[PDB]
């Protein structure tokens, strides 16, 4: 769900909006490099429905 696709599940693959992941092999395990999109530099606006 994260190397073979893009997941919409929140915090399943990294903190942020998941873009993609890269698997790396570790001894007796696996390491995922989760690439996410994190919004930055917010600014206040007035809004309306």
């Amino acid at each position: 769900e994260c190397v073979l696709g893009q997941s919409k599940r929140v915090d399943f693959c990294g903190k942020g909006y998941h873009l993609m992941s890269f698997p790396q092999s570790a001894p007796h395990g696996v390491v995922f490099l989760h690439v996410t999109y994190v919004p930055a530099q917010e600014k206040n606006f007035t809004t309306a429905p």
Partner: protein, 49 residues
């Protein structure tokens, strides 16, 4: 109170073996219950996110 230190060991070793087995049974069942509690806690951490 009834037996001397050589006849008492025959009985005390029986008691020790039995009580150690009681503790072992308790700990084994606590591990098996902790696995299920951890599955439930992982599900709750997934539902939170």
């Amino acid at each position: 109170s009834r037996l001397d230190k050589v006849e008492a060991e025959v009985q005390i070793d029986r008691l020790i073996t039995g009580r150690l087995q009681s503790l072992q049974t308790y700990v084994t069942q606590q591990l098996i219950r902790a696995a299920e509690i951890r599955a439930s806690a992982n599900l709750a951490a997934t539902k939170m996110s």
